[PDB]
């Protein structure tokens, strides 16, 4: 087609006027678990006209989280505290998402109330020989074993989805996403590699399915689909979140979408889809020819591989992390094909309001 990443969209209610998200990203400056004006500078800098933003993963619950400093969307002072940052991106003429993160066994005692042990869809724990926990002194250690969640508590995770999705658009956030990806939470009872489970939430990919469905179908109900975005990431092995196949996983949590958006009436703000990085944009190709909707693809693109799948319709959008987070005009970067900051990696999760956070100049005229 001729259309491209500076075509504008209709996602649903928001016109955009580019199709580059800045996708969701911790970064842990939210010192304490609450927005403040760092991050509202932050999304500032990197909010466009018409932009489409998600923000970081957003704690749902207290025990949500499994990283240092990341905000939550639970309580009324993160609810107020938000608000600068949302009008921050809304003054600039941005839509914001608010990502609802539910981290699951991918956390620690160190997170958790009571310094209890992290839920999950099952008890076993993350392997501890490729991936560790950052914790707020910096340290990384070993993952320990979760609690896996009772059938019975499982409504109560998902009202945390609910009331976080409606302080989200409290706060004013455009509407909320969905993390049901990168062997968090909601990934944790969708993939086979994790998902040990006998009652309805294991065995079939319905069952698998059915956690991610039941919180969608929660925050839908609270909020309209068209307010929600949905991630999954059913090709990454992040935190062993495999699946034996993840292009039927994908197309189940596809089904499962369209299928809601006629239960319903309204169509989601979209689904928003992982690469791992041949075969890979085949999966990505199938989900998004399956899914009835618009389609926000992710992971490893630069501006070239951007405008193709825009043109290719391979995704109407496509966002972006480790360019924005050096990028805070990657919008105009990319539009003119001007130069990329590079990103430094140091400082993706470290604390300083400025540095490595707000400090990534904008292009010089
Ligand atoms: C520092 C950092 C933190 C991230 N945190 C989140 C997150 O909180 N929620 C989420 O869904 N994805 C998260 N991701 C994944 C990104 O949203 C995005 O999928 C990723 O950066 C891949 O695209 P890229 O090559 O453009 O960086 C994070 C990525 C980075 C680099």
Same mark, same amino acid.
């Given at each position: 087609?001729?259309?491209?990443?500076?075509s504008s969209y209709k996602m649903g209610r928001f016109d955009l006027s580019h199709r580059?998200?800045?996708?969701?990203?911790?970064?842990?400056?939210?010192?304490?678990?609450?927005?403040?004006?760092?991050?509202?500078?932050?999304?500032?800098?990197?909010?466009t006209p018409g932009g489409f933003?998600?923000?970081?993963?957003?704690?749902?619950?207290?025990?949500?989280?499994?990283?240092?400093?990341?905000?939550?969307?639970?309580?009324?002072?993160?609810?107020?505290?938000?608000?600068?940052?949302?009008?921050?991106?809304?003054?600039?003429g941005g839509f914001?998402?608010?990502?609802?993160?539910?981290?699951?066994?991918?956390?620690?005692?160190?997170?958790?109330?009571?310094?209890?042990?992290?839920?999950?869809?099952?008890?076993?724990?993350?392997?501890?020989?490729?991936?560790?926990?950052?914790?707020?002194?910096?340290?990384?250690?070993?993952?320990?074993?979760?609690?896996?969640?009772?059938?019975?508590? @499982?409504?109560?995770?998902?009202?945390? #989805?609910?009331? =976080?999705?409606? &302080?989200?658009? !409290?706060?004013?956030?455009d509407?909320? /996403?969905?993390?049901?990806?990168?062997?968090?939470?909601?990934?944790?009872?969708?993939?086979?590699? @994790?998902?040990?489970?006998?009652?309805? #939430?294991?065995? =079939?990919?319905? &069952?698998?399915? !059915?956690?991610?469905?039941?919180?969608? /179908?929660?925050?839908?109900?609270?909020?309209?689909?068209s307010?929600?975005?949905?991630?999954?990431?059913?090709?990454?092995?992040?935190?062993?979140?495999?699946? =034996?196949?993840?292009?039927?996983?994908?197309?189940?949590?596809?089904?499962?979408?369209?299928?809601?958006?006629?239960?319903?009436?309204?169509?989601?703000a979209?689904?928003?889809?992982?690469?791992?990085?041949?075969?890979?944009?085949?999966?990505?190709?199938?989900?998004?020819?399956?899914?009835?909707?618009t389609?926000?693809?992710?992971?490893?693109?630069?501006?070239?591989?951007?405008?193709?799948?825009?043109?290719?319709?391979?995704?109407?959008?496509?966002?972006?992390?480790?360019?924005?987070?050096?990028?805070?005009?990657?919008?105009?970067?990319?539009?003119?094909?001007?130069?990329?900051?590079?990103?430094?990696?140091?400082?993706?999760?470290?604390?300083?309001?400025?540095?490595?956070?707000?400090?990534?100049?904008?292009?010089?005229?």
């Open positions: 087609s001729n259309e491209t990443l500076f580059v998200v800045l996708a969701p990203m911790t970064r842990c400056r939210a010192l304490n678990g609450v927005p403040n004006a760092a991050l509202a500078e932050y999304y500032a800098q990197r909010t933003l998600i923000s970081e993963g957003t704690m749902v619950s207290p025990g949500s989280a499994g990283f240092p400093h990341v905000p939550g969307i639970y309580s009324d002072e993160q609810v107020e505290a938000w608000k600068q940052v949302v009008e921050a991106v809304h003054a600039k914001i998402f608010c990502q609802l993160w539910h981290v699951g066994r991918a956390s620690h005692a160190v997170y958790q109330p009571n310094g209890g042990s992290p839920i999950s869809s099952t008890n076993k724990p993350i392997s501890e020989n490729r991936w560790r926990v950052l914790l707020p002194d910096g340290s990384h250690v070993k993952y320990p074993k979760p609690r896996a969640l009772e059938a019975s508590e @499982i409504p109560r995770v998902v009202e945390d #989805y609910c009331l =976080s999705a409606l &302080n989200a658009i !409290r706060a004013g956030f509407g909320i /996403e969905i993390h049901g990806a990168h062997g968090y939470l909601i990934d944790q009872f969708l993939k086979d590699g @994790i998902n040990d489970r006998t009652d309805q #939430y294991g065995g =079939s990919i319905a &069952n698998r399915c !059915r956690f991610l469905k039941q919180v969608v /179908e929660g925050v839908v109900s609270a909020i309209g689909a307010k929600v975005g949905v991630r999954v990431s059913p090709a990454i092995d992040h935190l062993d979140a495999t699946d =034996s196949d993840p292009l039927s996983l994908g197309l189940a949590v596809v089904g499962m979408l369209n299928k809601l958006q006629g239960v319903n009436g309204s169509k989601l979209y689904l928003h889809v992982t690469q791992p990085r041949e075969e890979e944009a085949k999966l990505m190709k199938s989900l998004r020819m399956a899914y009835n909707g389609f926000m693809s992710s992971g490893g693109f630069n501006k070239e591989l951007g405008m193709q799948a825009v043109q290719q319709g391979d995704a109407d959008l496509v966002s972006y992390g480790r360019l924005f987070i050096a990028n805070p005009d990657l919008v105009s970067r990319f539009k003119i094909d001007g130069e990329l900051n590079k990103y430094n990696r140091k400082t993706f999760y470290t604390q300083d309001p400025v540095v490595g956070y707000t400090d990534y100049p904008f292009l010089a005229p």
